[model samples]
Target: MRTYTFDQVEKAIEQLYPDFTINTIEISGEGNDCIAYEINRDFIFKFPKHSRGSTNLFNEVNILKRIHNKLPLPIPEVVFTGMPSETYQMSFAGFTKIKGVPLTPLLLNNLPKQSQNQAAKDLARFLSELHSINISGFKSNLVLDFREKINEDNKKIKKLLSRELKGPQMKKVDDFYRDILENEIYFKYYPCLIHNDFSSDHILFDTEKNTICGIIDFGDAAISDPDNDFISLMEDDEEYGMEFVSKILNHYKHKDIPTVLEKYRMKEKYWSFEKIIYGKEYGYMDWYEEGLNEIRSIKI
Candidate 1:
């Protein structure tokens, strides 16, 4: 993966604009896939870290434009896109900064119960609206293939987890994998437009208005089963697992509540192990430890 130092990012953007006076460049966020820079506190530039990241970034830019103003809440508006150059190996995109801060789990826990519920209600409506969109023409290279995907994940357990976990823990992982691998219903779902990465960090909140300002980061947006969204809701510590996810699912409009909840349960069952696999693949020790801790904390 190609990584650009802070100076290289600033210089690349500067060359792209040349005329636009750059006041300040701030590091917005970095993840396994992409590194984002907040330029002049008004716009965000996202540069890809690899070929897949490049494709996803390109798709994200186009998808944002395709769905702009279609939903109730605000979203990122692409202001400029830059071609790949010597300084920056991959092409990048810039969008107007959406107002407010990410409503991360830490921040969500601090909000009043009423506020949390309100945010849940707002998110429910937004997701419902998003899922209702016609996804006929939208395309993504990262297509959903549950059978192969799960098979690969199962292999990851043997390759990565066997050495790290005990016999009991490994047995649980095997059982969990068996359940999903054998269940045909678990693989069946009507595809819909999903945020794909609807974690709290991608969700922005307005402190002054005490409302969800906007949802950002469509880089992972895709046509997939809505159940892919529920695992992140497990991030909520205050609600003790599904309470917070239930709040949103209760009001979700496009799918059967019971079935959705059941699928969410299935997905949640493997979320920690998935995290560990991702952590190992991406070399994120924090994610590795977090996944291991969650796995250890689980009681049967």
Candidate 2:
């Protein structure tokens, strides 16, 4: 962790892209997986922040090489990859930059209603197109069976609730978890390529054109639930409403959108439980309270 600082990033940049040796690289975006840097005003260099991200780097490389040209919006296309050396412990990837400002939820909210709907329409189509691609031989090991994950979270919720909840809320929350866990149907879905972290963070927009121009980041690519591909959308906005989903239904002729939505609805039952325990463990008091409030409001 200490090795991936800004000064060290500068040293790594020099080792790989000497064309920018005279110009200092600028940090762009970063998260648990990798730290990104803008290089020479035209390209972006990204280095994994940890060892696990090294493997994720390889996944992103293959997925991007296969799908970059297939999608409607621009996505990262790797031009060079730097092997591990002194400045960084793991491999890195560089690509010519795709230009767009991040369309943050805050920005989306403030945009005119027409523009907001257009953004939703464009994004829904992008997702539909990406999901249609074939991933015949891709090794997406990061993919977890949602059935197994729900069971794991169920156990965590049970143990955590034993010591945390003891009233009407406790009984109701416990019943709901058992209902979903025992049914097993809620966690099941057909396999398709999913950008497992299709959050607002990965999407960028051209404000002038009133459209999305960039959809970056595929570090969490997976062959998992098709419904999981739309989780971020389901969480995105009350304002965007079902218009975004309607676009997908129209684009993806065969899919049952309401059926997928039902799965998400069931998943939401235990979603707050996982968040609550995570908040308590990580000392995110507001998150913990939010979960508790959700549980407490269940006709209690």
Candidate 3:
């Protein structure tokens, strides 16, 4: 697929919604897969950077529809959805723009304890509600066993990195592959709805209010071990992960905190492995070093 410009985006939205006249547009952000634009500062028009992303958009829309009504916090409502058009090459979708900044560790730590506590409770409650829903009958595209998926992923990464890395790097990669493949016991958990990509970047914080206003990006939402969902909450450091997630367990109050924290340990380790495997796909190699550092940092 070809890279698109804002000019083409404006034209596409205009062609689709001939009735609504946008006053202004802003480039909200771009992730590994999606190009997002804020229109009139009130709505987000997100387009897939490639044809493959169309399926991701579809899954996200479906997940949001399923959870929107029952959710405790705000999520983007599907104001407009689209297919391949003359103006837009692949496919696209739009929603009311959610306000707030991505909840990174630097910012989260600086927040007042009261605010952090509130943020934790709000997040915990929202996650509890989402996971509590019976997804038994819901038809979703998400996989149930991420371990199988990641294990399969390990095969490809091993081959790819075999050519790319040497000695120390290769040994590190080899050790991770071994650890991840052999750790089947940790992966066994009751299947539940999980926001598998529940990364801090998707968590939106209203700094002014000192609270989590909403969450964004359900593109990676799925059915899996609920423990995996909290993996991304570890964000920049495991210490913060322990602290915030400890608060989450306080509100959730269902699972044992220490047990869940241990899961975060392994899951977080997997996150580093994942960056090494999938990073190249998204034009990200910087995470490789970061991930390796994380792997080495673990007190294990």
Candidate 4:
């Protein structure tokens, strides 16, 4: 993974944006594939950690340009893009910071009931508009083989858990996989542009004003199952889980409502299997144990 030092980031930005002077620079967040630097609390410069990061960053910058001023909410507008060089082989992006903070599930719960209701409408509007965009020209991965991908992962998970899971637990897992694999229509959908990572961390909110102000981080954006957009909402918190997703759908005007809702249910259950794969592959025992427990306890 390519890591950057504070000084290195500072120098790179200075070289990229000669007119902008920095007052502050600090690490804001680091994900598995990228590192974000908060520059002067006014701009955010994100750098890729690997080749995959490089590709995602490239897509995000282009996607932002196409979607800017096209949505109901504010999204990052790329201000400057760094040139690839010897110091950092991967390119980077800078954008004016969006207003407000991440509307975490905890923060969303604290808002007034009115605010919560409003959020549902706001989110539904944003998604409806976003998904409706014509992304025929974009080169992002198409999710046409989603079923096969899930089947491959399910096979890996079954093999990994077969020795550890109790008989009933394995039976439940088998039943869950069988239901999804047998359902031919469950995975069907017109491929559309999706946020791909529409979760609390990417949703910005104004607590004092009690509204969702902006959406950020489009690195994982893709052409995929529209249901990919709702899994985070269901997995975010139980109280706000299905009920909140239902509210969003109530206001959401899109294709195949029943199909999308069923897909949501499928994905909500499938999240644990993903976690189990991630945990075992990355050697995160906590996640591994948590996923195993959820799978064992899940009702098929």
Candidate 5:
């Protein structure tokens, strides 16, 4: 993997874009691992700096190739990828700069009723399309054993809390692990390809159209339970989430909505723990706090 300093990134971009000069570089997006920059009006570069496994960039590239055209919404177009050189050790990718605003801030205040419904419908349609992809060709190296993964993570969380937190707050972590373990059967249902880390951060919205414009950051894509994508919706503050859930269930026409719903809720709890452990291990303080908040918010 390449460790790119600010100067190296500039040099690499200059080499790549000899004609167009990069006047500025700004770090965008939620994750600390990647640096997103607007080089000019025509392009944006996303470079992977920190990822848990060796295959994150390659996995993302594969996922994008598999689903880009099939997706209901636009996804980032990987224009350039691979290790640029020895100096820029990190694997870098550039996209054709999709134009839109993120849905996070807009939905924070509560989307208007009609807009909420439209967003829900769009989200449902998008998820259904995403779920329909066959996993046979979707190669990835990330571990998908959610149960074992979460149990291991809970042990780490126990250790972390012993050192950093106390009392009822600490007890909550213990209780969270216990409850999820006791209800393990609920998480053992149908599995499918899942965007393991789907969140508002990954979703882009066209405010004018009142719809999801695109999804980016396929680094965490994995073949797992389809319900995994619902974690964000289940944990989201906007009441539009339930509406989104309803649209998805209705669109898929699942015979066992209640059963699946219960399963997704259980997986969300376990996933919350998994994400926190990952954040702490990776030095992602923001994700650590977000994960803790999600775990705290659950009514267990």
Candidate 6:
């Protein structure tokens, strides 16, 4: 991970805006991907980690720029991009901090029922617009070989389940892989622009309005089975899982609702276990635990 100080960010901004200063810098969210610093007023400076090359940052910037105007909901505005300084050793991008609370907090039953419904509807509409984009021009630079990537992921998870996890957790994950092999026919579904990491962490919600305020973080965006988005939704929002799924599918103008829903549910169940095994192997015990808990709570 790259270490960036507030002074360094302020210096970089000074070169561009010339009248701004960074007031405070803090690790705002989960993962060590980027450092978000609060500058003057409501502006934020996000310096990417060195592990994330300029290409990654540039891709995210480009995605934001492409979707900002077209999205149904608000998104962060990229204010600056480029190498801050020779010594900074990391490229960074700045955006106007969006106004909203995290979706997790707003989904805690404090909001009115109607508001919650509207929020789900907003998310469905947003996803519909995103899926409508023609990604034919967008290059798949992240994963060069799809089959190799899936095999590598499967191997990593198998090792982790065999070595680390125990009892039913291990058994469940093992069974999941076996089922995948038996059900190879399902993997033939067409691929689309999928937000593979569509969890609550990446979603921003306006509690008062009961709607999604922003859909940030396009790092894991790719062309894959559209069912991938449902993994996180089903894992987190069990009560409204099917409802939200239907809304999104309807917004996308998908016919044969039953078949699409079946495929989405099956993929969600498979990926749930796959992620658990992989998380355990990668030392993400929290993710492993959460995955298991969701599996227990929801009947896929």
lDDT of each: 0.79, 0.72, 0.75, 0.80, 0.67, 0.65
Q: After superposition, how far is residue 218 of candidate 5 from its true place, in Å?
A: 1.8
The runs of at least 3 residues in candidate 3 whose Cα sits more than 4 Å from the true structure, single-residue gaps closed, are 84-90, 165-175, 236-239, 282-285, 289-300
What C-alpha lDDT, on a 0 to 100 scale, does residue 188 get in candidate 5?
Answer: 74
Model 2, 97-139: lDDT tens digits are 8788877767777788788777766776787788787767766
TM-scores for every candidate against the unseen true structure: 0.83, 0.79, 0.84, 0.84, 0.76, 0.74
Which lDDT tens digits does candidate 1 get at residues 1-300? 678888888787778888877788888888766899998899999988887787778778877888888898899998888785543434889999999888877778788999989988888888888888887776545456778778898897778877788888778778888887788777788788888988777788999988899999888888788776765566436222467667887767435666666666776667768878788887888878977776666755
Model 4 TM: 0.84
Among all candidates shown, the one with the greatest lDDT:
4
Put down candidate 5 lDDT per residue, 1-300, tens digits, no spaces: 335566787777667666656776665543545666666665677676655322466666667776768877888777766563443443676777777777774463466777766776677777788878777654444437767766787788887657556577778777877787777565675666667777777778887777778777777787777766765556645322665666656766656667666766666566666667778777888768877776556565
**What ordering of candidates by TM-score runs from best to worst?**
4, 3, 1, 2, 5, 6
lDDT of 1 at 244: 67
Task: Report the lDDT tens digits of candidate 3 across residue range 115-178.
Answer: 8888889988988888898877766556566666767877776776676665666677568667
Q: Which runs in model 6 stand beyond 4 Å of their true positions?
A: 11-20, 30-32, 52-55, 84-90, 105-110, 142-146, 159-162, 165-175, 178-186, 236-240, 256-284, 287-300
Write candidate 6's Cα lDDT for 133-211 as tens digits: 7777777774234455556766777675575556765666656666656664456656667666776767888766667
Q: For candidate 6, give the lDDT.
A: 0.65
List the lowest-lDDT window of 10 residues for candidate 4.
Answer: 231-240
User: What are the runs in model 5 whose C-alpha is more than 4 Å off?
Assistant: 1-4, 14-24, 51-54, 84-90, 105-115, 140-143, 164-179, 182-187, 236-240, 264-300
Residue 184 Cα positional deviation in candidate 4, in Å, after optimal superposition: 2.3
Question: What TM-score does candidate 5 reach?
Answer: 0.76
Winner on lDDT between 2 and 3 is 3
On the 0 to 100 scale, the lDDT of residue 195 in model 2 is 84
Give the Å error, residue 190, model 2: 2.3
